[PDB]
Amino acid sequence: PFEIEVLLPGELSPAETSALQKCEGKIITFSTLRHRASLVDIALSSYYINGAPPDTLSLLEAYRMRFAAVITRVIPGKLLAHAIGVGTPTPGLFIQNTSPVDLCNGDYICLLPPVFGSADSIRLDSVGLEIVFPLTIPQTLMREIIAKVVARAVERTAAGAQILPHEVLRGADVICYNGRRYELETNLQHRDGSDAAIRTLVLNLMFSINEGCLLLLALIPTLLVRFPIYETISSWISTSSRLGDTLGTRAILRVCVFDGPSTVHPGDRTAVIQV
Amino acid sequence: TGFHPGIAFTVVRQDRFATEQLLYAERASESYFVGQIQVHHHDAIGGV
Amino acid sequence: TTQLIQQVSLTDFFRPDIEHAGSIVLILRHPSDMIGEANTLTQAGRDPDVLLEGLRNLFNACTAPWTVGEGGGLRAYVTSLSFIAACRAEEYTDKQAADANRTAIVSAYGCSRMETRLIRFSECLRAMVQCHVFPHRFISFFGSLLEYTIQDNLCNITAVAKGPQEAARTDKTSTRRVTANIPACVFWDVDKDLHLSADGLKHVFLVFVYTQRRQREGVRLHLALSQLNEQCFGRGIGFLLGRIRAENAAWGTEGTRALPLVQLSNDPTSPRCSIGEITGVNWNLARQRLYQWTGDFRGLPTQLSCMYAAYTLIGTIPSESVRYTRRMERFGGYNVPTIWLEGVVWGGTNTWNECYY
């Protein structure tokens, strides 16, 4: 009937201690279930096999299958930690706001680490270990965001492959919510994740859609005014089932602030709770 | 160009100057009644 | 284990004094993204001028233009559901009691200058439903409201996640136990197939009707009480609304043959053009002899315009032999229909699904 406490580096560099104190309020990912998770990040990108190591899917799966933890103040000599995953519940937890997007209480929220552009992270030269903070967004808004990202990537690929320009100005593309402006696809450079890791997934989705629409258009419509030809259909069904299973639904997070402020900005007093 | 006034006109000006206040009450002004106070336990955002 | 959320409210759009304790309220959201996405939602099938005029007159009728319009920061969060429930109860083949209940409601809570606002809201919602903007993505669920206080244009509205009906014991009135009464006159009768002995953990489905008729499109509140999962209920809503689904499909088709290419692709010795395509010397000179098929996309530009199912799995009850009871009371001269629903718990996540099978 005990708990697990993280290690405390005693007599460290003043810069390292200052950085740890500054990042103390930031969310810290939980360690492994059994003993410890220190070389997992290093070994995650070890199978480069003479090329870019696919790590987006692996990190997404790790974040979905791993819980979180809340750290406390640092005291020289003794360290205290709190965990509500498999240990004992705690009477309220304080976590600083991280996601710049506005959030509303009384609604179910999900967790999904972004992979487009850049994300906040902490890295130390003398440590060599980096931690990526996932962004928490509601599922309803997340679905629209990912759909818009997929559409923008598809249109960018079409423009880059067709040679001639094909972008048609359909109007303003600025999303405004509670006085906050959010502009997407404001640039067409330094795209290190647009067609690097999700390119294979979007290509598979596109070819599956193409084969399905061809198969239905072959004989299905009738009111409009040695090869069994089944292995391809079976493979398409298997890939569709696999992607549906790997899509996942991580709705376990919730926000509930007692008499909190209306506007929300990074650096406020929020609460963390589950359902 | 010239702004020749062919008709009369008026303007509206509003002012709001802060002022002090003096309070004085007699003995038979108001009374006070002490209620019942009890200790209750609640939940905070970081503890009890 | 107790969580509370505090929200602000206004007096010109909500009067907490009339409402009693134990009521159920739903939190809305500002249409900041909806006013921008309506252009894509309306699509080329309809025009966005009607929606623009509707939102313009809604903003004009709404008070405090300096706060609302682009953010729900200083707006009334809690909104009474009785008005919309009474408004949407017209198409229920039961109006004798509704008219009697609404005659006093209009006389007391309404009067003054409210008919114009009511008609404006009704036409705005009719235009929103007609244009298929899907405004149901802002409806949530909350617990009972047993506490209310207001001093000057500020209501300290508080709520809880679960329901402590069996453990509250406020003892602030002559009663000994708390209760939560909410009318359920819009409860759809779905017992025609479950009239037999069925007991257990019954599930409540919040189904929204989305009709696609001619100038009679609207969303009406509906309730259900039956122990079913997401598959059987979906199949029931699929093959039980067949007539209205077919009518909507026929109305929405506001407007092409087979092809033998499959046979020649299946048989061997098929004409393959890969080296020529790679070289590019016949990029366009080789495709001129192919099958054009004379395809046209004017037959059906969109297919998601026939959605009629918006059920949400919200609300659970483990009590056996469920049977609603309706009594008669008085609030000073006007009777109110109240249902005794106490000593129960609720919970679960929302599942907004758009089914058009």
Q: What is the DSSP string of A74-86?
A: EETTEEEEE-TTT
Q: Does C71 reach chain A within 8 Å, measured CB to CB?
A: yes
First to last CA, chain A: 24
**Beta-carbon count within 10 A of A153 CB:** 19
Alpha carbon distance C241, C249 (integer Å): 12
C270 touching chain A per CB within 8 A: no
Contact C315, C348 (CB under 8 A): yes
Backbone φ and ψ of C127, nearest 5°: -65, -40
Token digits of residue C82: 């009785």
H or E segment at C105?
A: helix C96-105
Q: Classify the C-alpha dihedral C184-C185-C186-C191 as positive or negative.
A: positive
Query: What phi-psi label fits residue C26: left (phi over 0), alpha (psi between -120 and 50 degrees) or beta?
Result: beta
Calculate ∠ Cα A143-A144-A147, nearest 5°: 85
C-alpha distances out from residue C191 to C122, C155, C227, C308, C312, Å: 32, 41, 11, 21, 19
DSSP structure class, residue C205: E
DSSP bridge pairs for C187: C223
Local structure of residue C304 (DSSP, 8 states): G
Task: Identify the bridge partners of residue C309 per DSSP, sorted by sequence position.
Answer: C355
* C17 token code pair: 């004094």
Chain A residue numbers with beta carbons less than 8 Å from the beta carbon of B46 are 92-94
Cα–Cα distance, A199 to A123 (Å, whole number) = 28
What is the rounded (10 degree) CA torsion for C80, A139, A243, A34? -120
Place of tokens 């609460």: A271
- Report C:280-339 residues touching A (Cβ under 8 A): 299-300
Burial readout C220-250 (b: 16 or more C-beta within 10 A, e: otherwise): bbbebbbebeeeebbeebeeebeebbebbee
Q: What's the rounded Cα separation, in Å, for the pair A208 and C56?
A: 44
Distances from the Cα of A29 to the Cα of A119, A228, C290, angstroms: 15, 50, 58
Q: What are the tokens at C95?
A: 């109006």
A140 closest CA partner among C138, C207, C71, C356: C138
CB proximity A162 to C under 8 Å: no
A109 contact partners, CB below 8 Å, separation of at least 6: A103, A136, A137, A138, A139, A251, A253, A254, A255
Q: Could you give the CA distance from residue C245 to residue C330 in angstroms, rounded to a whole number?
A: 43
Picking from A142, A163, A214, A262 by the largest number of C CB atoms within 10 A of its own CB, the best residue to mutate is A262
Breaks (C-N over 2.5 A) in chain A follow: 225
Q: Which DSSP letter does residue A163 get?
A: S
Note the residue count of chain A. 275
Tell which of A24, A73, A94 to mutate to test the B interface (max B CBs under 10 Å). Answer: A94
Distance CA C251, CA C66 (A): 42
Q: Give the resolution value in Å.
A: 8.3
Nearest residue to C341 via CA among C179, C223, C189, C226: C179
Residue A182, CA distances (Å) to A103, A105, A178 in order: 14, 21, 11
Q: Test A273 with C70 for CB contact under 8 angstroms.
A: no
Residues with Cβ < 8 Å from C98, sequence gap 6 or more? C86, C89, C90, C92, C185
In angstroms, the CA A54 to CA C200 distance is: 48
Answer whether A140 sits within 8 Å of C39, measured CB to CB: no
| C-alpha–C-alpha distance, residues A234 and C19, integer Å | 59
Helices C115-130 and C49-61 pack at an angle, to 10 degrees, of 150
Environment class of residue A230 by beta-carbon count within 10 Å: exposed (0-12), middle (13-18) or buried (19+)?
Answer: exposed
Chain B: nearest CA to A93, how far in angstroms? 5
Convert B6-37 into a string of H (helix), E (strand) and C (coil): CCCCCCCCCCCCCCCCCCCCCCCCCCCCCCCC
Alpha carbon distance A27, A29 (integer Å): 7
A185: exposed, middle or buried (Cβ count in 10 Å: 0-12, 13-18, 19+): middle
Tokens 């298929």 label which residue? C132
Of C36, C70, C140, the CB nearest to A179: C70
A47-65: string of b/e by CB count within 10 Å (b at 16+)?
eeeeeeeebeeebbebbee
Partner residues linked to A176 by β-bridges: A181
Question: Exposed, middle or buried, C9 (CB in 10 Å: 0-12/13-18/19+)?
Answer: buried
Q: DSSP letter for C185, please.
A: T
Chain A residues with at least one Cβ partner in B under 8 Å: 91-94, 257-258, 269, 271
Q: Which 8-state DSSP code applies to residue A271?
A: E
Task: Kindly state the tokens that stand for A81.
Answer: 């930690």
Question: Is residue C123 within 8 Å of residue C115, measured between CB atoms?
Answer: no
Pairing of strands C202-205, C313-317: antiparallel
Strand residues in chain A grouped as ranges (E)? 28-29, 68-75, 78-82, 94-96, 108-112, 121-123, 130-132, 135-137, 174-177, 180-183, 253-254, 269-271, 273-274
Q: Does the CB of C39 have a partner CB in chain A at under 8 Å?
A: yes
Q: How many CB atoms lie within 10 A of CB C287?
A: 11
- Distance in Å, alpha carbon of B40 to nearest chain A alpha carbon: 16
Q: Give B35→chain A minimum CA distance, Å.
A: 26
